[model samples]
Target chain A: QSEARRRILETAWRLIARRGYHNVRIHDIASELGTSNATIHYHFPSKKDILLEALRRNVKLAFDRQVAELHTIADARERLVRLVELQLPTPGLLRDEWSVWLQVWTESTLNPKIRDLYNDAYDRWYQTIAMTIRTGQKQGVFRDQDADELATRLSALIDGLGIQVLTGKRGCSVDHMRQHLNDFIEHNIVERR
Target chain B: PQSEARRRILETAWRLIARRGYHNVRIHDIASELGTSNATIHYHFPSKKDILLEALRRNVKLAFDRQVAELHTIADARERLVRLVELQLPTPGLLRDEWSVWLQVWTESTLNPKIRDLYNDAYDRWYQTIAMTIRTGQKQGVFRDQDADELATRLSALIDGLGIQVLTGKRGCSVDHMRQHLNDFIEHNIVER
Candidate 1:
């Protein structure tokens, strides 16, 4: 991607985060970046193409970065907490990601391509979390269980609680969400002395 | 019971919204789906949002009523909680449609305040139901003494998160797998024995 194309994609993501996938128009993106719609069309033929590229570059890559950072952390318990925090829709970092993802999830129902992209992202996410759980078990810190199944449950909790937190539901603060995740870890994953 | 035309319109609208999403499904599309005129839809719904709102409200009510009825049949509080998870799994027909509408509702609530209020209220109702069950179990000494609201949130979040994955065909999470995970959570977190 050219610098110019990257700029357009980033602008599209920001606008989509604020508005929505269905709500954002190509002209809106062009206007946001002070570029012409034709230029956007030149890079990506349609609005759907732009949205897909934006999601790939912004949401997927951002998550990949976080997973990479988690690998750098040695303690599996700390890595799990960091993963929960990263998944939560905090005030600044992941709030926008949640907004954009909410739209992607909605679109994925109708759009096959978007659905495929979402499935791919989720598969990678499950794998990363499962790997972390397996490492913890190997280190004799986490309980003996199927890491893949445990990962599925933990990811489900994060996604589920994250939605509540994003939607402004009562009793779903960042602290509340973190506590819930930590508690799950302690109960289901932590090894009993 | 409503008129046949009105009932057909509502049912059709629900299916379209579930399949396409709230944003993508227009009155024109609904009319096309039902082989009726836009005027006929407007006569029944007045506006797209009006119909979608009614459909969403009806869906939530129907689900709540069913859950309540099922809970009445189950005497054990732990069994009631497990039954709730069983009710939530993405089964083939109505359950699948409910999940689809739920995803759309979450997405639309971000853009529309009215929908947001409806979503929040529905969530409160659900949280209360779950909390009440937990409280009952604690009172009977059948479950651990924990924060009912927090436990409810955790359980609900896990279900919501897993529902998304199941709906999207990610992680190969079958309905059976979901039940196993939910049972695991109950065994580890809720059960006293």
Candidate 2:
């Protein structure tokens, strides 16, 4: 039932990515899971609960697994580049992550409880970036600057380009975004040495 | 509440669209809120499309152009760019509304082709505006000699990335913090030290 419940959460995220928050119904997940609404709700009580765990699981894995891998590498520059590279959402994993996020942003604008969850998720994501910058800064492999500010700048660029790549905005392609992400690091963050 | 017709239609239209996602809103809602009839609203805006496009152009897009005009009056290119950063901060009620409209439209553009066109054009205009400023600063030796278009795009992306964070909630990423991050990028990378 532990593994069983995980798929339910994953299925919920897929539903969210395909159709936004308000549009995705619980039975939709039940339909995908080949189960009834009661089965889906037996584990996850409501739509927001489904979304919360979906996002919560994403943030957890991002830090515990992927982001932790970045910490293992000795080269701070490589780690920084890897952190940015890992965020490119072309893959199925990150794409769903972003699509769910896009809807979350739209829904959060109107809701109360979701806004609290939204704030918590982004804060940790932000700290990961800032934390990456600080490690690189200490290694003398990145620029000596306010790590949070750099994180803010870099995170925002990712977001700005993230929207475009996922939306297929003409000015920025995924490849274009990828190149910009790398260049943004080399140009702005890397130490002059 | 009884109000002037054409302008009233636009104000109500912008507010409704921002509050309710575009598909979730209707001309009837706008008319109802205005204490007017659908036919009366139609007389002001021939279609819902016209009202939305008009809301974005006059209420949203024009503010940038107005600031651009003001930016032209500053002599020092660095000063102009600094002022440009300040002008773009998403703090003011009007500025927040502009971003809110943008946030919704960007999400919609993912699925809606018609809005994708408007979103693309809006982005191009924004990137061009920033790029043009970067070029001016480069000529005056106030900004770095990097690719102006790339610099502009990155700065614009950073603004967007940070903008959304602040828009979501001011808990961790406040308007002042957003402003500082933007300024930090400009001061560190854009300006020729």
lDDT (Cα, tens digit) per residue for candidate 1, span A1-193: 5999999988888888778777788899889889888999999999999989888887567777796877679998888778777777877657888888877776776788999999888887788889889989898999999998789889888888888887879767878888888988987789987
lDDT against the true structure, each candidate? 0.84, 0.78
What's the C-alpha lDDT at position B134 in model 1? 93
Q: Report lDDT (Cα) of residue B138, candidate 2.
A: 89
Question: Can you write out model 2's per-residue Cα lDDT over A1-193, one digit (the tens) per residue?
Answer: 8886899988888877877766678888888889898888888878778888788787787777665666578787887777777788877877877887887787788777778777887787778778878888888889898887677777788998899787666666778898999987887889888
Which CAPRI category fits model 1? medium
User: Which has the greatest lDDT?
Assistant: 1
For every prediction, compared with the true complex, DockQ reads 0.76, 0.58
lDDT of 1 at B81: 84
Q: Which pairs of residues have clashing backbones in candidate 2?
A: A156-B161
lDDT tens digits, residues B1-193, model 1? Answer: 4488887888888988777677767888888888989998888788888998888887888888998788787888888888877888889888888888888778778778989999999999888988998999999899999889878888998888877877777756777777787898888788887
Write down the lDDT that model 2 would get: 0.78
* TM-score for each of the candidates: 0.92, 0.85
Best by DockQ: 1
